[PDB]
Amino acid sequence: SNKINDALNQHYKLNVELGLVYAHYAHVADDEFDMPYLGKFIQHLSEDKLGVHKEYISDYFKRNGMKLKTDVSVAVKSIPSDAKALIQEVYARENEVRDHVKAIAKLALAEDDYESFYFIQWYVRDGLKDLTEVDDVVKLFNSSNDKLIIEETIKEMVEHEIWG
Amino acid sequence: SNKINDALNQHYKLNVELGLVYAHYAHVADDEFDMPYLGKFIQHLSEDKLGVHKEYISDYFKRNGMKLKTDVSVAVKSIPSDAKALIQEVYARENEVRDHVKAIAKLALAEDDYESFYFIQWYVRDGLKDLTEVDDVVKLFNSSNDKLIIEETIKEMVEHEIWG
Amino acid sequence: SNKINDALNQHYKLNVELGLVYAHYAHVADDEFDMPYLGKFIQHLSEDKLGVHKEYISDYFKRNGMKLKTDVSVAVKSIPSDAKALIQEVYARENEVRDHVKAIAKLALAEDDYESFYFIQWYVRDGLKDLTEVDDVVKLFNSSNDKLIIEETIKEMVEHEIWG
Amino acid sequence: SNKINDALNQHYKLNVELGLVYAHYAHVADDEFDMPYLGKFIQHLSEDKLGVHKEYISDYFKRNGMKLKTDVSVAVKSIPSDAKALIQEVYARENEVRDHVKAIAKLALAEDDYESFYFIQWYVRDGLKDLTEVDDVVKLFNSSNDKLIIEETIKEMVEHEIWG
Amino acid sequence: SNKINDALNQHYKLNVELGLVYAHYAHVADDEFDMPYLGKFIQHLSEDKLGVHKEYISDYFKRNGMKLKTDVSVAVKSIPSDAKALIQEVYARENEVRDHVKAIAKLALAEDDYESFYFIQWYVRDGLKDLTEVDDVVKLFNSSNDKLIIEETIKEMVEHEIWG
Amino acid sequence: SNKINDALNQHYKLNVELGLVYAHYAHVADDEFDMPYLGKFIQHLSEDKLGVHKEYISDYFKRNGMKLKTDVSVAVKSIPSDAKALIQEVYARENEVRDHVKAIAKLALAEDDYESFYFIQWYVRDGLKDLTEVDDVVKLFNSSNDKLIIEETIKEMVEHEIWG
């Protein structure tokens, strides 16, 4: 089936682009907003987005017999004003990748291709896991106004059976 | 100094592009040329190119006070015919990054910016180290004709005080 | 060469004077500004400035055959108003010692005296390391207004491969 | 009481000056008189003179409520002829610091300031301890004429309940 | 570049010749001057001169792509009169190899060949290290006149972070 | 006896020359014939030829009362075409040193100098041991034609009561 091929290629592309964008956001949050631990958090997100999230697609392509296509285009020319807008933008990106994964899963189940469904279950779980991990931090900036308190909270954060 | 800034930005861009290209080459060498261990070798190269090689530039920029710029554009539309041409192309890329690093070091020393010189010494070493690691394998395909012998050699390979 | 001798003697003198000044600043920050941990931080700076930073110059003089000269004159008759101005003054002193080291390195390389260059590389690294360590704390007083939060941050602070 | 303040400030100044002078003497004894172990001995003396001997005064000032004053002036323009005159000069400096401490203790007891007396007991002990440690070595150069025998003796030296 | 090739070939030749000469001097100091430990010292020097000091040049030639040339010519027909002249001659040889290394480093930096500079830094350090190790012993024969005292000193000698 | 002196001096000279020649052959076999393990083998041979094989003669000369003479002259201006001719030349050198040792032993026994006979027994054993070790490898190139198989054999080789 070529529809699953196209959808998984789109997901590969999206994952690479998000990895690079998150890396840049982590750097700019460390260098300008004077919050190194928000930088470490977004850097861990970027590493997970550039590692297993695309290595698994490459491996599945090796295993079932599809063709891979590399095509990336990223140019970060705009950044938000403070840490709150930055973390809300990261949250929106996660909320979008959730819907993309849902669309791929529906397409796979409508093709009678149950190996691809069993494959995409991992993503329909990890999407919610990571969105929750990011929402836990976007909730912080609604709770206090001293930067160092939020810093220590995120520090102790970085220091389940269904989802986790 | 802005010249060092421009040169290091160019190096950042080059490193990201090479990382992606090497990842694709590793996959296509595993999937088509029936050599998984050449795939593992090129994958380790891609990981080193996408990790520390750009994280160190990001950290140095954080530390001295320069501005980072993300701009990538990669589209792999051509691949070689057999493993020998693939490994020779990888070798050529390494031979090019060597010259790029040499130019950066000359520019840094001609600016009276000795912190950047002390910083780029690491790269003028790692360039030769990695070029040697790749030449060791491009020498293999001039020595035998059975694929599995080369496979076992690379397997035992993956299994100094100045350079290393 | 006598020019390198004069430059290294000037550096010896500067290091001794900075050691004493930092010791006094640590005491006055402990006794008046009610911040003992800022005192401990500046005391560790003073110890590093009065120890190895001049012992290494004495050793190099013993080793290559130059003459040492002791001449100190310090009189701290003015102190800043609050901890922020104190830490900014410490930062300025670090930013000055950086330029002094850069000048010595240029002079050494222009003399064809490569042993002195290999010797001063240690200083062109440690300058950036220590300036970063002090900037990390001068960033704190732009982030909060409760003294004890900054205290706990510095406490957990006191509790790399290129630079560090 | 301000008299104790003045006396302890004088002792602080004297200790810093002696520290620097002893450091220079250690270097010149290592570099010219071809005796590295006499250098190590005088260096340990200089470290003890520049460390606890003034840190304790700084701490006591923090604790009782007096003001500290930093004012140093050292210029070593003359050095003795051989190791014997050097060690005799060090001995004379110790014999002088003994009398200075005795004067401070008398002044403290004549003021009805018994905390300062309890504080200065440590110094009236350490003075005799260190003078004895130096006399043990100035006795050596009255016993032999081979430099290396004295060297081995001092080496094994560097390798009580009332005083010690 | 062929100039660096010629210079490194000259250094290879010089190192082999010095190795052989030092071996002969060690033997003759053991057999005639009745000092076995001076023999052991000079033998360790000869081993370091014949081992890594030329193996590293061979390895660098393998690594960058230059050609090696073996041409040796040694004939020890004259020896000094006592141990003092012997150790002073060894010292002079070290003082000469220092200048040879300095010339090679200048030539490398004037060619814009920074890999050779990074390579020769090791030698510009080891030269000073070894010259200091030999001067420590040539200082002994200015301190005493009993042979066995010097023997025990050298015995305990044979029994840093920048240089060492 | 001076005849034994002359013969042992000749053996000393021969051993030094063979050491240097073998070192060069090891390098050229690593750099040109693309066989690093043959290089390691010949390097171990060169180390044994330059170490104990001449240190024992130096020690025996110290012990019985003869005079040592250093005179070397080597110029490697010709090398064979492939690894087989190289290893056959090494074998011929071993076959020659065997006969030289036999001649020395006959001369010693014909002089009624039984200490020299007891001394040379070690060499009349080690000659056969080393010739066998080299013949084991010159037999390999008569058994296969893939370079990497021979490589793995020599690798596992490098990884008795009369002779050994």
Ligand SMILES: [Fe+3]
């Ligand atoms: Fe994830």
Ligand SMILES: [Fe+3]
């Ligand atoms: Fe690398």
Ligand SMILES: [Fe+3]
């Ligand atoms: Fe420091």
Ligand SMILES: [Fe+3]
């Ligand atoms: Fe003391």
Ligand SMILES: [Fe+3]
């Ligand atoms: Fe050495």
Ligand SMILES: [Fe+3]
């Ligand atoms: Fe042998």
